[PDB]
Amino acid sequence: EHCSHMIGNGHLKVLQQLIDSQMETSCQIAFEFVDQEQLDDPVCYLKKAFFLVQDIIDETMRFKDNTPNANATERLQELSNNLNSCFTKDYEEQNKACVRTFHETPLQLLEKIKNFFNETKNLLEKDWNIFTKNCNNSFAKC
Amino acid sequence: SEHCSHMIGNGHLKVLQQLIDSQMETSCQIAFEFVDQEQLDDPVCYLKKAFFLVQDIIDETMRFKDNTPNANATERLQELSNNLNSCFTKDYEEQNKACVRTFHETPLQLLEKIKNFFNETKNLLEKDWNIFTKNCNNSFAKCS
Amino acid sequence: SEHCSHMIGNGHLKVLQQLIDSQMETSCQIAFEFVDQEQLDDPVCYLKKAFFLVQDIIDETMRFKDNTPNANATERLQELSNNLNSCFTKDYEEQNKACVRTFHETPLQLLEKIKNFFNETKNLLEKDWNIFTKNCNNSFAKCS
Amino acid sequence: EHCSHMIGNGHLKVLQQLIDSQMETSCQIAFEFVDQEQLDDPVCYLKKAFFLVQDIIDETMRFKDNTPNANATERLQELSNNLNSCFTKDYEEQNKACVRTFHETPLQLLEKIKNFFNETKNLLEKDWNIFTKNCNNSFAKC
Amino acid sequence: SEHCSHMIGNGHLKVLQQLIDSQMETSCQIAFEFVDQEQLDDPVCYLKKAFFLVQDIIDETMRFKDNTPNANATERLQELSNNLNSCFTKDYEEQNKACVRTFHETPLQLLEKIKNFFNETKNLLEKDWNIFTKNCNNSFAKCS
Amino acid sequence: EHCSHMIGNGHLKVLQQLIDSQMETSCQIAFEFVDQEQLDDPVCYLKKAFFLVQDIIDETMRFKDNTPNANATERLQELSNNLNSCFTKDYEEQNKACVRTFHETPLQLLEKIKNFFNETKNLLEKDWNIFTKNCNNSFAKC
Amino acid sequence: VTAFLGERVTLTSYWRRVSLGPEIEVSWFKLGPGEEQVLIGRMHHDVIFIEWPFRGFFDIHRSANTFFLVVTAANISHDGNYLCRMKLGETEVTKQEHLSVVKPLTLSVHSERSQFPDFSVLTVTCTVNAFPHPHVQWLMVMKEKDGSLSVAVDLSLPKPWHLPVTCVGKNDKEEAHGVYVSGYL
Amino acid sequence: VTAFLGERVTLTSYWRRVSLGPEIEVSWFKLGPGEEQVLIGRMHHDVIFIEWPFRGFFDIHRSANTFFLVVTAANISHDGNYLCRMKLGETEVTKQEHLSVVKPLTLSVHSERSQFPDFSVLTVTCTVNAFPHPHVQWLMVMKEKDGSLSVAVDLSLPKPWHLPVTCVGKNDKEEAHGVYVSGYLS
Amino acid sequence: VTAFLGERVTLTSYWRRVSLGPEIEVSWFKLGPGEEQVLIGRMHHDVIFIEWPFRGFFDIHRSANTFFLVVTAANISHDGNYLCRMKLGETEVTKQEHLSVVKPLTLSVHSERSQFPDFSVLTVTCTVNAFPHPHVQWLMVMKEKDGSLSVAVDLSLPKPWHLPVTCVGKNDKEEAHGVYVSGYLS
Amino acid sequence: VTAFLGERVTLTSYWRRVSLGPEIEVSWFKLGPGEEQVLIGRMHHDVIFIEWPFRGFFDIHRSANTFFLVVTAANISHDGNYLCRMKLGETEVTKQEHLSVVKPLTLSVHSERSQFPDFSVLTVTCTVNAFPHPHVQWLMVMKEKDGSLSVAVDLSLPKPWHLPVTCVGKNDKEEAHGVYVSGYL
Amino acid sequence: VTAFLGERVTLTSYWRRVSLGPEIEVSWFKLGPGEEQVLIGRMHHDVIFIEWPFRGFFDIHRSANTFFLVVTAANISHDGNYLCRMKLGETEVTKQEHLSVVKPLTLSVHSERSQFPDFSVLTVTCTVNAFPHPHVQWLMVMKEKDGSLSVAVDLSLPKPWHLPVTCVGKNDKEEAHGVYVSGYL
Amino acid sequence: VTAFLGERVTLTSYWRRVSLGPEIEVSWFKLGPGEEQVLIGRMHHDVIFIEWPFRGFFDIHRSANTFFLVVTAANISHDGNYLCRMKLGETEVTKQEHLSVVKPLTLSVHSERSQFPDFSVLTVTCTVNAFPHPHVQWLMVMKEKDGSLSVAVDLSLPKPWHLPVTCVGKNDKEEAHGVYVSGYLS
Numbered sequence A, D, F: 001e002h003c004s005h006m007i008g009n010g011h012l013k014v015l016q017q018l019i020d021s022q023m024e025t026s027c028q029i030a031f032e033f034v035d036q037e038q039l040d041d042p043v044c045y046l047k048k049a050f051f052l053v054q055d056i057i058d059e060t061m062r063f064k065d066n067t068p069n070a071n072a073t074e075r076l077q078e079l080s081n082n083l084n085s086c087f088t089k090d091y092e093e094q095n096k097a098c099v100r101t102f103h104e105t106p107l108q109l110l111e112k113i114k115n116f117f118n119e120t121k122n123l124l125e126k127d128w129n130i131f132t133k134n135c136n137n138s139f140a141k142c
Numbered sequence B, C, E: 001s002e003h004c005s006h007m008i009g010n011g012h013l014k015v016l017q018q019l020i021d022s023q024m025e026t027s028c029q030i031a032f033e034f035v036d037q038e039q040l041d042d043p044v045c046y047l048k049k050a051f052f053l054v055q056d057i058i059d060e061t062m063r064f065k066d067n068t069p070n071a072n073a074t075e076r077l078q079e080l081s082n083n084l085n086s087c088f089t090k091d092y093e094e095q096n097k098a099c100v101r102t103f104h105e106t107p108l109q110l111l112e113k114i115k116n117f118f119n120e121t122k123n124l125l126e127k128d129w130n131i132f133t134k135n136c137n138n139s140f141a142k143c144s
Numbered sequence G, J, K: 001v002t003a004f005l006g007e008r009v010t011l012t013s014y015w016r017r018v019s020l021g022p023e024i025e026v027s028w029f030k031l032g033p034g035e036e037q038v039l040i041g042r043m044h045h046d047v048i049f050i051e052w053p054f055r056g057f058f059d060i061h062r063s064a065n066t067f068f069l070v071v072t073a074a075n076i077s078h079d080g081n082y083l084c085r086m087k088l089g090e091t092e093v094t095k096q097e098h099l100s101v102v103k104p105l106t107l108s109v110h111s112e113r114s115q116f117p118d119f120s121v122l123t124v125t126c127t128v129n130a131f132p133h134p135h136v137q138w139l140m141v142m143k144e145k146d147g148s149l150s151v152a153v154d155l156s157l158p159k160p161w162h163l164p165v166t167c168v169g170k171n172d173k174e175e176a177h178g179v180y181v182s183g184y185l
Numbered sequence H, I, L: 001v002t003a004f005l006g007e008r009v010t011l012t013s014y015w016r017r018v019s020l021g022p023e024i025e026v027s028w029f030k031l032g033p034g035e036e037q038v039l040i041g042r043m044h045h046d047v048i049f050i051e052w053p054f055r056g057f058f059d060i061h062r063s064a065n066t067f068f069l070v071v072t073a074a075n076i077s078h079d080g081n082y083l084c085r086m087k088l089g090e091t092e093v094t095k096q097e098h099l100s101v102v103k104p105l106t107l108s109v110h111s112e113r114s115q116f117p118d119f120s121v122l123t124v125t126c127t128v129n130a131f132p133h134p135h136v137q138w139l140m141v142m143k144e145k146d147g148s149l150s151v152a153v154d155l156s157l158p159k160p161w162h163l164p165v166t167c168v169g170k171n172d173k174e175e176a177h178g179v180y181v182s183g184y185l186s
């Protein structure tokens, strides 16, 4: 039941600060994320996104040790670990399904993360059991 | 002016260092014009030349979302740059874009160059606030 | 003239039919100009056009040893043709050799065409000895 | 002995009428007949010619049924059949020897027939045993 | 002059024959101009023509070490040739080098030709010391 | 000991007369003789030359029978035969060694012969045992 | 008269008076531009001789009063006007015939998508190779070595592609259609 | 991925960690039949080297953590599977991509009339040149130098000619029609 | 029948009954070795069709009851036997003709003198190119691309040259002579 | 910048403002003599298209604000000046780069003795094939199909031959030596 | 002097004074039209050098006062005038020789009958290929690649054919005859 | 005897007795492997005849008792042994000569830098084309159409390039050197 309030605005604020502090550039990086074209259902979209966000946070969002943003990323990683208990397992078949390679700006990637945490937060507040949902169909459609 | 001695404060270097650390580490390389050390080694003339290039880079390269802490840092530095203009004497217009090279490097490395500029410039101004009155026409002309 | 009604007699058609039957049957085909039915279907104008072609064919094509029964038959028909000239009115000279085609057929088939001409012409003259006063400028012009 | 008078002028007249009634044309037909270049002896020439004339009459001289010329051809065919008894057999070796292909006008062919009947008639009147002659040599010369 | 009869002595022919015999026999062949017998057969005119060619050959071809017996022989013959000049009358300059051929033969064969010349010339002079007054313009002209 | 005076000036005179009587020409003949470039030692040079001179005299110097020069060549040949006893044998290995082909005028060949006889004569007069010398080394050097 | 590429074809001429055939000195000509006359071959008393250039492509033979010029196999060069001159003594007649050779049209359709600035513009191509008068048009010139004529027209289609699309090709009276229905994607 | 004949195409691979780019030893391969591996080219520290066979047809370039294999112009031979191996020290990762090349089908129709015993039998011919899977059919195989495939079908029509007549050509999902409407003479 | 190389030639056949011409199905053949029958061309109702191999070399045309096979230009290959088969319904007749092609003989004479050991031996050469049966002889075989046959004979003459000298060449009944009279020098 | 024959080479250009990359309409040109401009290829929104002539020899790709023109394999024709035009809306910038191709010099030495009037004059030959500026000189121009330049110098030596003899060949800054030491005889 | 096609031939020159041979600087020339001089080769002190164009076709060698120019194998191009220049110090002599090459004539006879208007006119052809002066004539010019000359004459014979018929061919002094005796028919 | 590629060369033989020259039947031969004897040409009474194969490459001429075999232009094939047989009646003498042909060595040096993994390895190449015995060596075999022999050696140099570097080429007693001094860039 604690999943309702696991995500705090302190986290979204630290995330947004992190976003704003990044320098705007043209350079594009490659990363795996959810293909909206094949998966539109909000709940299942977020459900799938969660694990991809875990990985991106782990291997992509790198900062110099002990920098405010480095600690921000630590907080978010911990948050992700606590959130593990709020998402139910679906199937292993679907991992790497509904997923595409994206070549975009770091800013756009961080925006995707922000949207995830925000919408995830809202839906959890509305119904902390929302992510027990079975999405095998939504995933298979892709 | 004698005030050039203390125009640059550690507050500026602090906001600058913070700005650097807050940047995400990536592989992507960008292109920008800066002073070629290979053709221009004289510390004084090197910095003098670097100053204007730093002005331009600050203006057009270091872009942040409006009203962001780093955005304000860049504003402070831009203002600082504007005030420092009166401490550097004009040499010649022929030499602008001479002793200058294209660099393809990480944003972090660029920002390091900027930091280094402000640091060494600060030191030299403190030693002699008239150091940058120097005529570098020769040092510049040496470049090919 | 009103006499055109009876100028052609069955005696002429008889000598003509005899001439046809007396001819030996062969495979060999000859070339001659005659009226193209495909471009000219009007019975009256068809015959009018045919008449002159029949004159020419009779003159230059139907050749027999002098003083032979068939030779005399052809003479009679030629004379008959000469008398019939006054029963056909002139149309235009442009159209002569228009509505006209080259035929490569057996002599018998040619002679059949001639026989058919005289027969139908005879009938139509008997019906109306003024039938061939008709202006066929249009019917002729239709041909391409 | 009747061979002397078997051919009558009624036949030559009907033949000539038949000839004159034919229309003069350029078209040429093909038929087998005696080559004068290889066989000049009058008696043997006619002797050889007789059989070829039989065949030509049979297969070449065609007219519409019951026409005067059709009947003419009938009379001549009968005459040929009666004449069979007046020519003696020579050899089978020589059949198709002294013979060439002719490409000529129908009129010229009919003229050849006329000449045959005329000269045959004359020689028969002179000597009705003339065509018992042995022509093996004259034929072999070809 | 009448003395032409006896200008040539057997002493000259003797030194000449000796000269011939003293020569070493070899295979090597040399080139020289002489009278072509094929185009000039008349004995008198042949010798007349030969005379001048013999003069030239003697002068430029028959070379011996100075003051050698054969050298002196050649001198005697050259002198003899000079004296004989007055016994041959001039013909024409056109014909010089006409009736003349290139010979590629052994030295011995050349010397034989020379010997033969002097011998026959000697005989003919003895017979008629005026023999070589003859006009050979025709005999020479015959050559092509 | 007679080798000292075996060669007389009568021989050198007859040789020189023979030389002078020859007509000077351009034509060149081929013959084998001692190569000065490989054999410079006077004694051994002459020693080697002797035999080559024998052969040249025999086969090269040809004159018409009973001519003064023919007899000259005879005298010289005899002289060569008597001289055989004055030269000692060395080795058979060396025959055709130190020897080259010469393409020169007859006059030059005869000059070579003259030089041989002259110098040979002188050295014999000085020391009639001079040509007992061992020249195996001088020959091997070639 | 008319015939198709490669086919055997016969042009005809004749003597007016039916009595005569071999006696006539016949001679055929190929009419190049400017009413120029190139001798093809001659005939007299059934003695025929074709000029070597046309040997094997043309032949002459006779039947009665009729004279035939036979083209063994027609190629595009042969399309044009031919002339027959027939001579008897001093008199001579000229008759004229026009041989039209035809090549059955070959319609072909094929498409490609733009490579710049995007891959949204699909251009289809309609190509007709015929003779003598090929024609292509979309519904809403090169010369070949064989001597025929190829012509083609292109049509650009921005997304969304308004398929199907149809092109009409035709060779005078001959006609055929092509329709592009769907792309691969 | 899919591309048309001649077009420029780019297959991609990347390093999981975004921090690294030049450090990675990248190497691309062409998977011939039998799972054979043909080396196309290599890259390291922005030093690229394409094997001479593929020189000019393929190129490699980089941006950040991303690695691109660029086919300058695709030809039929290129259709198949490609493999990218990326190495850092002892560790290496393999990514696989499938390039399908396509040749836009070319349908062509043309007719000729019989020359014997008469000129009454009109035979029409429908011809499709495409890749990878051409197909022709009348509504009642040769390999080209370009590497494409041509296939054709013929239809005989006795007089009277029951025109118009239609043939369907197609390349998998691509499709097009040809219709003979009228002859020159009739 | 007989004809010379290159000339136009016509073999003939006909139908016994003069009444019929176009109705007959005519067909000509080339009799290759082994009594093989090669179809040249066919004719029916004045519709002619020559097989493509013989197209342009042979043609067929008709007049009344007569049928002509025309060789536009005779070449050596054509020499042999030809067969005409004529059919009406179930009945058929066969006629055979023999075409002999001939190439007018070409006799040629030319000489050369020995180059060793001397220039005294004069050798003359007589050469005949004909068809079908060339023959050369001095009065004391190669096949050409045209299909003709060349044959030649040589004669050596030691000095004194006993000239004139004559060679006889001939092609069956055709005959011609060549005579070398004098050399350039002697 | 500089590169050797056959090697892969990259010329670069960029947009001043670092914010923009794909938005820029990039277009490269090869500068023939007279400052003539031959279009190599274009790029926009990562949509690249090389003109067919240069297809396979040149390629374009991007990274951030930087634009790269890649010569897959350099040949002599490529030596010269290249131009990059970058356009955003109404504004456009032109940047210029000079590519120098180089062919490693090939020095070769070889000798021959005179055949007339005697065999005493030995002439040695020193030959350097390089690009762009080959040079040969003895110590005391032909164009090849590959587009490189060959130049050679000859030296005559009368007997006695004063060996050894040395020739210096060089290609601008590149340099190499050849020394003839001894003859066969 | 004279020689036949392919044969080895030798032109000669010499020095008047018999004493000298090697000392003379000999040089031979081939005289093209306009008395033009093309250097064949040179000789001095038995050192010979032929210009590369003539290398293998010509050679020079000496014997005593005589100098020989040897044509290894004569071809038609060689027919013409040759010049030998001999020099001693300041003095020089020019001697001239004319080499006539000859090609043994090749007479050939062959016939054909007219193909129009009848087959009665038999035309026989007499052909002679020789050099330098071929000639054909019947009793009552083309240039070949080898450089020789072919000439031919034709004779028409109306029936009855008045055979035999004879043609005379000849090459200056060389001569040969051809006689057509009988036709096939 | 010895001669260089292309040069005119003369081998000699002679008759012992100086009296005779033209009378001798001279004949020259090329000694192929296996002591095979190939007839080059013959001479007698100043009548010369070269066999057609050697025509234009070889000639024979005479002066007095001497006989010369002249190679107009020597090529590598000519290197070997030649034999002259001279005959008078029943008696004959044989002389043997050895012609050594030589091709002046051609040394050539040229370098290229590695294209992968870096541009630090400079490889120099030393190439010698000569005859009969070429040899190349660095100071730390193909047959040509001309009949000569080419041989080459390569040397790799990692940075720093220890220049200058020297290679020795030689053809038996002939010898020459090549030295790479500096690259274009460093």
Ligand SMILES: *[C@@H]1O[C@H](CO)[C@@H](O[C@@H]2O[C@H](CO)[C@@H](O[C@@H]3O[C@H](CO)[C@@H](O)[C@H](O)[C@@H]3O)[C@H](O)[C@H]2NC(C)=O)[C@H](O)[C@H]1NC(C)=O
Binding pocket: H053, H054, H057, H075, H076, H077, H078, H145, H146
């Ligand atoms: C389609 O693309 C392929 C590449 O995937 C092309 O293959 C390449 O073709 C070239 C030219 O035939 C080959 O190069 C040749 O190499 C030989 C030596 O073996 C050399 O002598 C020739 O001068 C030539 O350079 C190359 O080997 C080959 N590459 C591979 C990997 O197969 C192919 O040509 C393209 N197809 C078409 C129809 O264009």
